[PDB]
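Re: the multi-chain job from yesterday

Posting the exact lines I submitted so nobody has to dig through the queue logs.
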Amino acid sequence: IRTISKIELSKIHNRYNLTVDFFNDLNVIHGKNGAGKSTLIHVIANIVNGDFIRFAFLIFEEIKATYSDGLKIVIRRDKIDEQSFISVTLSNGKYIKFAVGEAMATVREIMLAMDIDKFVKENELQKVRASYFPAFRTMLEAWSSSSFYNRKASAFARELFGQFLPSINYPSPMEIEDRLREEIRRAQLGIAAYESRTFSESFVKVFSALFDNGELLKEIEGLAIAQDSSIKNGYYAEYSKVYEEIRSLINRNVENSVSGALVVYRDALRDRQDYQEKAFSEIDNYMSSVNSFLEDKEMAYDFYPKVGLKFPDGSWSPIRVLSSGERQLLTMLYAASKMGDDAIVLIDQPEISLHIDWQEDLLKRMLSQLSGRQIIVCTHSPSIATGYEDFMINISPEFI
Amino acid sequence: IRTISKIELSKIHNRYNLTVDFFNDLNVIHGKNGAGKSTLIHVIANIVNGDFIRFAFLIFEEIKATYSDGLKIVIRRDKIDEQSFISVTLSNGKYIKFAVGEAMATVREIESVKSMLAMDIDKFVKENELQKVRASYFPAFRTMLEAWSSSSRSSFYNRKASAFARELFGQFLPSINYPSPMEIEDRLREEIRRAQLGIAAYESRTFSESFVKVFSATGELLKEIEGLAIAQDSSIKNGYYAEYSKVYEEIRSLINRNNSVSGALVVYRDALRDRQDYQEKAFSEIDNYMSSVNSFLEDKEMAYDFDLRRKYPKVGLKFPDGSWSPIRVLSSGERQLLTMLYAASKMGDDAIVLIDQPEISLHIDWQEDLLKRMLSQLSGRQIIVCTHSPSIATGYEDFMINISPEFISS
Amino acid sequence: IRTISKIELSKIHNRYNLTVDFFNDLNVIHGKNGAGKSTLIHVIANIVNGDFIRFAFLIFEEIKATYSDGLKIVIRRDKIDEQSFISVTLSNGKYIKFAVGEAMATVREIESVKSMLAMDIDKFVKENELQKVRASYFPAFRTMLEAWSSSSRSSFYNRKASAFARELFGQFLPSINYPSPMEIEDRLREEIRRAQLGIAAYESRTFSESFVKVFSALFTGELLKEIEGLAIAQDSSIKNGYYAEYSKVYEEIRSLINRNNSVSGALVVYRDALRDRQDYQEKAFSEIDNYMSSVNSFLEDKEMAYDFDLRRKYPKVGLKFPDGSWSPIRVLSSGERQLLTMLYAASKMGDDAIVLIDQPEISLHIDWQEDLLKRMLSQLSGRQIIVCTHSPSIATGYEDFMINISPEFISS
Amino acid sequence: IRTISKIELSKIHNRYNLTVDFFNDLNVIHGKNGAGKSTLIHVIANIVNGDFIRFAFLIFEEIKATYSDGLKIVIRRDKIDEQSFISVTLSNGKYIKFAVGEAMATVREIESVKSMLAMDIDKFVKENELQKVRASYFPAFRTMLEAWSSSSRSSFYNRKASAFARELFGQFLPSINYPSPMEIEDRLREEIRRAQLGIAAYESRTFSESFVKVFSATGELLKEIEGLAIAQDSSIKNGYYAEYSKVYEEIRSLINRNNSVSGALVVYRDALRDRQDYQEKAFSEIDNYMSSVNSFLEDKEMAYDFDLRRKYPKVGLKFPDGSWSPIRVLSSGERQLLTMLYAASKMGDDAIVLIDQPEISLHIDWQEDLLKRMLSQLSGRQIIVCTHSPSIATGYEDFMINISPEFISS
Amino acid sequence: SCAYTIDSYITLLTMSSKKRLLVEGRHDRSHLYQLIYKFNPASKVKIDTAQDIKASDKAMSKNNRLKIETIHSKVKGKDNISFLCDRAFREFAFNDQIEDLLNSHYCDDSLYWTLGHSLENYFFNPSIIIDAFQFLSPSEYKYKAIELFSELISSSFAVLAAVSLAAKDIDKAGLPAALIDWKDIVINDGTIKLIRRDSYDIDSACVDSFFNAFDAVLPRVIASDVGICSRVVRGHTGILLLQKLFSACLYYVGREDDALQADSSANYFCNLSELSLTTALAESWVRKIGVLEDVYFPDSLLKNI
Ligand SMILES: Nc1ncnc2c1ncn2[C@@H]1O[C@H](COP(=O)(O)OP(=O)(O)OP(=O)(O)O)[C@@H](O)[C@H]1O
Ligand SMILES: Nc1ncnc2c1ncn2[C@@H]1O[C@H](COP(=O)(O)OP(=O)(O)OP(=O)(O)O)[C@@H](O)[C@H]1O
Ligand SMILES: [Mg+2]
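And the result, structure tokens for all chains:
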């Protein structure tokens, strides 16, 4: 796919220059205080999201962005007739110049934005998005809980920290809970469609077995025990009754058609169990990644779908009772999941409110989900970057 | 269940008295303009819904209410030392009393979390169980109210709409309990999802039962199986799986190349019959509601469709040209017919359908069939309608009740 | 003074208990995620500030707080006839008891002038002297909170920020008492003005006493060099911005001496007067220079300093750059502002308090975390610092003061 | 400094013309009711303050302003193609021109971020240096304005008060530039702090310079030294140290128990005299202002008090019974006298004192002494006062200017 | 850089509840991760590297072993951490014959030493070297090269040990890495003889001193036991020396069919990255544990954690 491979900044904030060269899988940016980590994350997020109207609010000279396939974007801030103009020039030669004052007026009001998105959609600059995790995730989550959440939180955070700040679009825990409920509903409907298919399929399988001339009962017993004690079946979890009826009628009565029907029944049971496991594959993988971190609780679902936290006494609690660090762990593990949106994960200070035993495994459990996405983190903690010191990038800007 | 049967009013606005007896099934009310039918509707709604705090906003002396189970409620307005009080006394001897000014201060505090008086009223109606039956209230201005809601509501979340309505029409006005089309759409989607889940559970149970019955053990049977497969393939409800005819053809091809096979054939036919009957059993309420709704619509029909590509069953308007549209593109009269039919449907909650001027934005064809289609759903709800047109009340002249106020010289 | 010594919790949120024993100087509190560190800090800050009406918003059974002098406060939440009640019982038998619904109604009325319950709570905490020591509370969310405050607060007038933070994070959260950098700048200006006035009073007293001693005692090679060194050191100080003419007076006195016993006494009392003025300048500016030396140990390309000019009459306090430019203390970054506030709270200039910091490693580089606790403890204020951290770079070198938290889950 | 000399108006509100020349020291204006003196005050305030965007709210033809240094400014309103324009042309040839409707759009944008026209006006008044001297505008309703402010303002932040005054009395009304009594109190505290720091610097300088008088070095001097010690110990300014009497007694005892001694006595007397004279010089402005204020106060006096426990000095009313009261206990007339005397004080900045009806809630004895006390301070500012009371303008009949509006036929 | 100091890491040990292992380099971390994950693929042991710990002392800055000893001394008695270092030439006797004074893994309060010179000496079992070279080969004449190599590997360890000992006598440990090239090696009847090439980029004095030390140490290495001999070879030296010895034997036995193809294959093998060789050897070493009794591993260290 398309990944950021180089970012150059010239006279940004009229203060410094900085050229960063990236990897395609993991980048651990680190540096001293005021080295420009957060501004680098903002530049990357604004370029990748295609939100070039943010660059009217940044004082700079030239910003060059190189992707993996060779696409290059050059953004310049020129001064003519005591007016600043932002010029975006691609590698294709197609360019767009817009005035700073018009962009500022449209921002304060919220035509030019339509031209910008026409230019972006013409050249496919929004092929891959970026999930932006700010350094102020906790108070923003607490404020917004008291894409519309993205819009309101982006407006509030841009009011607080300036208008260059990108659109906050990381998955909030409420969004995580809602999308988990939707995926559980979709998995239940897929199981229903599979049962409706396999009913008519197993009928002609039985009819094929009836026209041709021991441990199977134990295997059917094991499959029925596994399926009856499965949380994914909220309806008709009584295969033990029909298994007992089948074994009682067998022990009361050898036809080869009975053995063929037992083979068909065992195959139907194991195939329904296999489809039931593969329908809940993403949800179980995500909750297994989360539950490898949580100590005295366990994120789980139960049957209307219920998604919450089981405690060792068996009581349930919502996700809202979680800590700040545990909620941040949930969001950062969801952004790297396969059910999360495929993007470029940009996290600013991922070590916030995380114990060092979680910092040492955060990047490992994010890269072990085989998402294939590019992760760029900016950290102050040596425990985030442990085990992955080959991917550490140290930024030392040249101050002027 | 519990139905209202008699309402006695004394000195409403200190000028007229009214005493109307009611039936348990249908109560058609007819009269002249300004007879006090709307005030009687507000009194009945505040009595049935248990919102007694509205009764501090009425200039009256005594209100008597009688239910079907023998519960009688007497509401008395007193004025002692210039301070006005409301006392509500039940039939068993339980009663409460409060102040008019205290209730007005509570309402003004709500305008500017329940207070102590509202919690006292809630505790009194909870420990005596005075809200067994609710009442869906249809105001005469609901065409403006739905436009106000769409330019800015449900049966449970209607506080701002009720506040706006009570701002426009005084604080005696009851809560807006008639549902929104979005609530109807969400209820339809939830009913469809629950029907699909029950169909899947019954399919698993039927497959297990047929497999138990089929082991350890003709042309007309195949014809009936073919007819069942044709009927199930040509049904809207089987959008997730519509390949029964291929199953029938494979069964017939397996049979044709070569008793005990007849038992498997009849249990397979009985399983197909059980699935066909269970689908109609699950979708009976939705099909009855859509049959009542589509009996009025001409160039469109309300229908559901579930594609296997998506997992969200889409319910809405369908044109003969094949277009799919949401329910918000309906006009005022079609939306009124939809809401009044859902209020009389079995899908809605058990309440008393109180309608003021049902002939709002309706053609004269729909007026002669609205009450017939509401009563044909057989939901058993008690319906009280106040109309000025005979086209509403045609064919139901025995339920027509006239209101004659009793003027007193003062 | 009075410091906390033991906090015992019983069934917080009906699921876990905790018992923490504290030290009187520094308490580095660490634990796993979700252990109950921030809740413990909120409990301590509510108890020490005497804001017991917060405890109607927490589900618990019993919270015991022991101080260093032996005063024990026991807060118990009971449910009598479905009505919940908070009872605060001291060790001298004095007690109060109120309703949770009454406290919620009082807080809602404050949201929309003290009520009867607030006046009774304040009377109970004032007649028992429960509010001797304050509690500076540094929240974990302070970095966005001060940005919100500057986009629209002090240790004493922080009602809007505390109300907003309680709106976001629930009503049990304590008041935001940590000093803003504006409060730090105002306190630095007031301390500089007080030190200048004390220096002037010392100058008047020393002038009168020195004239009396000269006139009474009236009826040398090393002395002139020592007085020369003292006058050179006096002219080479920032504190002498209003007068830097000591060397000229020394040269005039030396020229009067050199053209021609009794003069030795005048020379030694002149040396003693210069020594006394220099030592009083060191003493009167001791706390300000100690705090600014702690802050300037962190800043790289700038230093916080004060300047006196004769043309104006306002002592300028702010950042100073090596190229001579001057900038105020609001041009600091977020991490440097965190260092400024967390070092002023542990200084002698701050109020007598217990410094409760939640996540002190927020927006700090790993080089500043290794020196933060050392520079807080090196000012010798005599405070009690309680920090809740996840960072081993904050807690390094202080493993004798580290407190582990492990709550005990109780089944239900 | 720069003072106004000549004001010529053409067709103010298309009804009257006015041409009044002004003195550089005092401008007493007398006339009948509705003569237009307040309009002239607003015109002069908008001319001097550089707030020319108020001139879009005035219907005029040509306004000529001539200062003392030769600065002539011509403001012309034109109506071309129904669009009204304001052109401001200086005596050096520099000019600007802007639309009236664009100015009103900028004003409405300010009512509902600086616009381009406001920045252009700022550039025009910055590159031409038209705002060297400010102008203090005293409205006739300033007591009601400060009562409204206190029941809910400064010379640098008065935007809410300016918006309220422009809403009440038209948008032509200029910015409220008269100082509040709270601003007077804050400026008094600031000047007391400046005087204390200057006294500290002089104390350090005298401590260093006393030894150069000692190294350079009877009964008649002891009496003067005792009197100086009594004067220093009985002074407000020496609250931090008032122990000179013990020093005098020890010096006298050491003299009596057993040349250069007379030299030491005379340099100590000179040092104490210089210390007292420097303290009097440092507090001279505040003492002159308080002497001007206390001439009107009967049973109290505005005074400053130091302290040794706290270092924050207190400015307020001291009674002969010993009570201390703040400045908010003063009445309306005392507050008006305080603001007018601070307007004529040397502590305030160089501006033009524009007062309309200074005699608001003033006793007739205070009116005869107000202008005497204002001119006794010798501030040298230009004062334009519009009054109807002859007790204000007695003794200064040479500076009394009558306003004669020249009515035009239309 | 962004890394812990000695004190910060000790505080981390106090705060962290994991089972930890401290090793010198990142390559040791990768190899030990494979070793641990073979026995327990779900193991939760965290392995830290002393290479990523800052030291204030200039001398201790690049001395990983001194960092480990300092940390171990200051937390001596902890239960959740174990330490592993490289034995180097410690506890070996050079009294005219190579003698191992331990013949087992060293243990001193959770501080362990590798059985060989370093961790890579565990790869020096002949079956592991064979399997690894066979898997990572040009795949042209692999079978005959492997057959010849299995004959040469028995006596080649004496040569490798002599090279390492000659390197440590003149303290130029990294000298044979760039000095000796695969073309200098000659394949004899089971032996090899690194001819002293006339042309070298380095000065002749160093080359002459190296061969003087090699000649003076070779008979002593010959008289020693082969098993003891295979453990004293320097870890970094041995990998490259085996890479060249295999490039030489491959070209020696493959030149007759096609000289150019054999030369290209030999140069391709010689240009292989060290990390590739170590990873292939590590995978082979992991697979051979438990199958052959002649493959060793730090069993005590694994048991302790
Ligand atoms: N308007 C501005 N916006 C942002 N940074 C600015 C601005 N003006 C100057 N700067 C400087 O530019 C640099 C950019 O730093 P940045 O805001 O990215 O913080 P950082 O490197 O993430 O640091 P940290 O989070 O550790 O405080 C800083 O030195 C900052 O002081
Ligand atoms: N309302 C609640 N009901 C039940 N449990 C709660 C509730 N609120 C919080 N908790 C749990 O109790 C603890 C509360 O304290 P808290 O989250 O602040 O601890 P912490 O160790 O400081 O957290 P952090 O992970 O942010 O460092 C957490 O374990 C949290 O999951
Ligand atoms: Mg940052």
